[PDB]
Design a protein around this motif. Structure first.
Motif, PDB file in Angstrom:
ATOM      1  N   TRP A 154       0.804  -1.285   0.023  1.00 51.76           N
ATOM      2  CA  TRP A 154       0.017  -0.006   0.056  1.00 51.76           C
ATOM      3  C   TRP A 154       0.911   1.195   0.183  1.00 51.76           C
ATOM      4  N   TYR A 156       0.118   5.599   0.403  1.00 55.62           N
ATOM      5  CA  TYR A 156      -0.735   6.849   0.266  1.00 55.62           C
ATOM      6  C   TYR A 156       0.217   8.159   0.715  1.00 55.62           C
ATOM      7  N   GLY A 157       0.204   8.803  -0.618  1.00 50.62           N
ATOM      8  CA  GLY A 157       1.036  10.076  -0.702  1.00 50.62           C
ATOM      9  C   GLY A 157       2.457   9.845  -0.789  1.00 50.62           C
ATOM     10  N   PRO A 158       3.389  10.101   0.128  1.00 50.82           N
ATOM     11  CA  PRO A 158       4.680   9.529  -0.019  1.00 50.82           C
ATOM     12  C   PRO A 158       4.969   8.392   0.817  1.00 50.82           C
ATOM     13  N   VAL A 159       3.730   8.031   1.695  1.00 50.29           N
ATOM     14  CA  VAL A 159       3.982   7.001   2.444  1.00 50.29           C
ATOM     15  C   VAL A 159       3.812   5.658   1.908  1.00 50.29           C
ATOM     16  N   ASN A 473       8.168   0.090   6.203  1.00 52.38           N
ATOM     17  CA  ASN A 473       7.639   1.522   5.969  1.00 52.38           C
ATOM     18  C   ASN A 473       8.671   2.581   5.513  1.00 52.38           C
ATOM     19  N   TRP A 477       9.484  12.231  -0.637  1.00 50.10           N
ATOM     20  CA  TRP A 477       8.989  13.352  -1.442  1.00 50.10           C
ATOM     21  C   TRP A 477       9.941  13.492  -2.615  1.00 50.10           C
ATOM     22  N   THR A 478      10.146  12.503  -3.431  1.00 53.73           N
ATOM     23  CA  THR A 478      11.203  12.923  -4.472  1.00 53.73           C
ATOM     24  C   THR A 478      10.433  12.594  -6.016  1.00 53.73           C
ATOM     25  N   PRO A 491      -5.297   1.482   2.750  1.00 50.10           N
ATOM     26  CA  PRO A 491      -3.919   1.741   3.149  1.00 50.10           C
ATOM     27  C   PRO A 491      -3.297   1.105   4.444  1.00 50.10           C
ATOM     28  N   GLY A 492      -4.016   1.483   5.731  1.00 48.50           N
ATOM     29  CA  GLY A 492      -3.517   1.418   6.953  1.00 48.50           C
ATOM     30  C   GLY A 492      -3.752  -0.040   7.442  1.00 48.50           C
TER      31      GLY A 492
ATOM     32  N   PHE C  23      -6.290   6.802  10.346  1.00 49.41           N
ATOM     33  CA  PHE C  23      -5.145   6.678   9.546  1.00 49.41           C
ATOM     34  C   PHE C  23      -4.636   8.202   9.092  1.00 49.41           C
ATOM     35  N   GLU C  31       2.316   4.902  10.809  1.00 45.80           N
ATOM     36  CA  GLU C  31       0.950   4.466  10.659  1.00 45.80           C
ATOM     37  C   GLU C  31       0.174   5.093   9.668  1.00 45.80           C
ATOM     38  N   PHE C  33      -0.472   9.272   7.747  1.00 48.96           N
ATOM     39  CA  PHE C  33       0.100  10.524   6.790  1.00 48.96           C
ATOM     40  C   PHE C  33      -0.746  11.649   7.543  1.00 48.96           C
ATOM     41  N   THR C  46       1.237  17.730  -1.406  1.00 50.97           N
ATOM     42  CA  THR C  46       1.718  16.557  -2.540  1.00 50.97           C
ATOM     43  C   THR C  46       2.189  17.180  -3.840  1.00 50.97           C
ATOM     44  N   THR C  86      15.544  16.349   1.337  1.00 50.59           N
ATOM     45  CA  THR C  86      14.527  15.210   1.353  1.00 50.59           C
ATOM     46  C   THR C  86      13.664  15.776   0.477  1.00 50.59           C
ATOM     47  N   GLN C  87      13.041  16.867   0.234  1.00 46.66           N
ATOM     48  CA  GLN C  87      12.248  17.436  -0.770  1.00 46.66           C
ATOM     49  C   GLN C  87      12.878  18.827  -1.211  1.00 46.66           C
TER      50      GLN C  87
END
Ligand code: 6OU
Ligand code: 6OU
Ligand code: 6OU
Ligand code: 6OU
Ligand code: 6OU
Ligand code: 6OU
Ligand code: 6OU
Ligand code: 6OU
Lengths: 493, 108, 113
Positions: A154, A156-159, A473, A477-478, A491-492, C23, C31, C33, C46, C86-87
């Motif tokens: 999974w 979500y976003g950058p995670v 995990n 952000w690349t 996701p979670g 979440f 866990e 975001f 984002t 990082t960003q």
């Protein structure tokens, strides 16, 4: 010649030929060139991908062939592969292309004549660039995704969380990847292979689960054994006879365990030898104490001092003290005994020279060779007094030799030792944090081996067509690509 | 010593050296000193004919020997003089040559 | 999907929705975001500036909203922001664009919980 080779196989050539000569299967690196003795392996290990495509499109080609070593093409590509500074990573791309064009799991799970898969062979020969590809292999498209080892389940976003496969990489099997890369002796860059992605967390998980408590328990047992040996040796009834029993049975247990540890291994094994000698001296002192010989105390004192020096083995487990211990070891190897050789030859060369020109009420300290080297040894650690009114016939030559000794040892040698150790302390300091981790993983795996047939309820995550996996995990952000290759919608956890 | 830049940076150097290097050396030196003290005090038989009579006197005489004070006499009241001398030379190599001179290179 | 999001809000979507689940409001870094639980804060944190422009041009958008932590969008952009290694500093540009498109001092002088 790609076109001539195409015209050859279009005229009825044999693509399953085997060049099984002695040149093509040499013994060392300069007599010949081992490549796998097939035309497909030759076209693969010489960066000719067009002939590789043309050979694999030929339906008479036997990709799953095995040569005289038992190697298939993937073992040969592992055997040819080297660093990035020698070849610019075409071997990884050839492995990728051939494995994807195969489309099944038969090539990866084939043992050679030593009983090794390409994964275990890459771990054995110590080739981190192909091993990092094989351990974390994400094939993006469908219709071939059981061939993967990583699984982004999974995001979500950058995670994102990922599942690393652990089939042949865990100690639950016989000859695993982690056990090969930890217990390897012939390969130098082990500490650049343990930092790979399903290995580094796999060591941390079993350090946190059971090995930390087991290490602390062993430390407490050895500390109480050394205390009970120390008090017994220092003070020489009914209540304090169990302590000598605890000294004896633990010495016998340590000499059994370290002996059968040494006799199955045939630098990285020093502490086994020192623990073994410290256990042998105690039972030797017991056997000489049951006799009438008074030489038991010389064994007991040596077992006590070496026993307290052995407590620096437990300075691993802490990072801050473990890196200090490997600094101590590198300094002992590279600098101290190299200084000691030159200091010994200067000391014993000036001792006879100073003791020779002494004529004789104990009017001089430099009467013999032994007294002269004792008086020269006391003079370089700064103890005692310096008297030059000896019983010599030539006082000026005596004084000149003594001043030359002071210049050669106190000014030159001892102060160059500091400047020379500064270089190695500078050099080891960017490396020692990995040498400590390599030193700790051996105790991790030995404590894993000590466990019974049960009590291995400490294995890793469940089944997900079902493989034991491992969650990792991550956040970045690349690149910001949209996610279409997930294994789970929600996701979670 | 803060308020002056030249002395304040020296004080924070003192603090970082105390944290990172000194007590790390002190732990290993203490375990070597107290491990060789009992070892040297054990092989002494008995007029105060030896300085290494007990544990406390042996660790005092080994502590005076690494800061360069006093004298080194090896004619003690020991049954095994060669083992006594070998343990004392091993202590001199382990502390004066190895540890104290690695402290300088590690603080650098 | 910028075009699908534009077609969604052009069909009558709710731009003031709050993803107040566990979440989206986690306790530690792995866990979930945390992003501010609004669509505008999600499009901001984002690096999607076109949807941010399209959301702020929508007159039903509530820029001065406050979530369960009391954070507005600028607290969320602060909370997401990290180093340059990082960003590559899109968060500073998003802060600049959102604060300039606001045009007043209400977002900067709002206290959270
Ligand atoms: C007198 C003997 C004191 C023995 C304490 C030995 C602790 C060694 C040490 O420096 O711990 C370091 C800090 O020192 C301390 O723990 C505080 C010492 C207070 C007394 C300790 C008991 C750990 O942090 P680090 O500086 O980042 O470590 C470097 C990582 N490679
Ligand atoms: C290497 C170790 C060589 C040790 C040889 C040795 O000690 O023999 C002594 C002298 O032997 C020598 O001269 C060997 C010199 C080798 C120097 C090599 C550089 C004998 O005198 P002493 O027993 O010391 O007199 C004390 C009164 N009992
Ligand atoms: C600071 C740099 C680190 C130094 C590293 C190595 C330096 C080695 C210095 C060795 C000095 C030994 C000379 C010595 O102890 O003098 C004499 C020789 O001692 C001995 O027992 C013979 C050699 C023992 C060597 C033991 C291991 C070295 C004292 O014996 P004695 O009381 O005169 O009995 C003889 C019967 N009349
Ligand atoms: C290398 C230079 C070594 C010179 C040592 C030296 O001159 O020793 C004097 C003579 O010894 C020698 O050097 C004669 C051997 C000549 C070798 C020439 C070196 C090339 C003796 O001192 P003294 O006058 O008897 O003391 C009386 C108290 N004031
Ligand atoms: C004997 C005790 C003298 C105590 C004076 C302590 C002054 C320490 C010092 O080095 O001052 C430095 C120069 O030393 C002096 O002030 C001249 C010393 C003459 C006697 C001072 C009273 C300040 O300039 P800097 O070298 O650029 O400082 C480095 C900036 N991080
Ligand atoms: C840690 C500190 C351990 C100190 C224990 C201690 O000093 O007890 C002395 C000996 O105790 C021991 O043997 C403990 C040895 C622990 C070594 C650990 C390495 C008793 O003899 P003394 O009182 O020094 O004789 C002097 C004449 N009154
Ligand atoms: C250069 C490296 C820096 C060294 C760092 C740590 C080394 C610590 C050396 C401790 C040596 C203490 C041995 C000592 O003082 O001997 C004896 C033990 O001294 C004591 O009072 C017991 C322990 C005191 C330790 C104080 C803090 C350490 C002297 O006592 P006494 O006059 O014989 O009275 C007993 C009744 N008959
Ligand atoms: C580690 C090497 C330690 C060897 C020490 C040593 O040989 O001590 C001699 C015997 O002590 C022992 O080492 C016997 C125990 C054998 C352990 C072998 C180490 C492995 C005693 O010296 P001495 O001949 O009574 O002195 C008379 C004065 N000339």
């Amino acid at each position: 010649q790609g076109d001539i080779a195409a015209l050859l196989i279009a005229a009825g050539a044999d693509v399953n030929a085997h060049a099984k000569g002695a040149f093509f299967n040499p013994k060392y690196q300069h007599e010949g060139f081992y490549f796998g003795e097939t035309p497909l392996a030759l076209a693969a290990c010489t960066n000719q991908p067009e002939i590789v495509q043309l050979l694999m499109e030929h339906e008479q080609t036997d990709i799953t062939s095995r040569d005289s070593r038992g190697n298939n093409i993937l073992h040969a590509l592992v055997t040819v592969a080297e660093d990035f500074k020698t070849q610019n990573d075409f071997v990884k791309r050839m492995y990728d292309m051939i494995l994807l064009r195969s489309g099944n799991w038969e090539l990866e799970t084939t043992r050679n004549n030593d009983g090794l898969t390409p994964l275990q062979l890459a771990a054995k020969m110590g080739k981190a660039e192909i091993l990092k590809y094989i351990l974390s292999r994400e094939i993006k498209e469908k219709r071939l995704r059981s061939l993967s080892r990583k699984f982004t389940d999974w995001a979500y976003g950058p995670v994102s969380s990922s599942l690393y496969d652990l089939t042949n990489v865990d100690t639950t099997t016989d000859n695993s990847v982690l056990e090969i890369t930890v217990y390897n002796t012939n390969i130098d860059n082990r500490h650049e292979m343990l930092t790979l992605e399903p290995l580094h967390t796999l060591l941390h998980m079993k350090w946190k689960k059971f090995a930390k408590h087991m290490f602390f328990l062993s430390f407490c047992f050895y500390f109480f054994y050394n205390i009970t040996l120390t008090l017994v040796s220092y003070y020489r009834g009914w209540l304090q006879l169990l302590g000598r029993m605890f000294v004896l049975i633990w010495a016998m247990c340590i000499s059994v365990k370290e002996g059968i540890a040494i006799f199955l291994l045939r630098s990285d094994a020093w502490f086994h030898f020192v623990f073994f000698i410290q256990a042998v001296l105690v039972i030797l002192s017991v056997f000489l104490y049951l006799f009438a010989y008074k030489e038991y105390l010389a064994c007991l004192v040596l077992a006590m001092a070496l026993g307290w020096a052995n407590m620096l083995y437990y300075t691993r487990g802490f990072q801050s003290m473990g890196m200090y211990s490997v600094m101590i070891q590198k300094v002992i190897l590279h600098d101290v005994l190299k200084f000691l050789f030159v200091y010994i030859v200067f000391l014993l060369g000036f001792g006879v020279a100073l003791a020779s020109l002494i004529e004789k009420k104990d009017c001089s300290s430099y009467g013999s060779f032994s007294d002269a080297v004792l008086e020269l040894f006391k003079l370089t650690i700064g103890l005692g007094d310096l008297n030059i009114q000896q019983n010599s016939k030539y006082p000026i030559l005596f004084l000149f030799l003594l001043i030359t000794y002071v210049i050669l040892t106190f000014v030159l040698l001892l102060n160059m030792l500091i400047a020379l150790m500064g270089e190695t302390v500078e050099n080891v300091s960017k490396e020692s944090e990995r040498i400590w981790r390599l030193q700790r993983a051996r105790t991790i795996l030995e404590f894993e081996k000590m466990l019974p047939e049960w009590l291995r309820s400490r294995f890793r995550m469940g089944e997900l067509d079902f493989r034991l996996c491992l969650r990792i995990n991550e956040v970045k952000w690349t690149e910001w690509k949209t996610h279409v290759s997930f294994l789970n919608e929600d996701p979670g956890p």
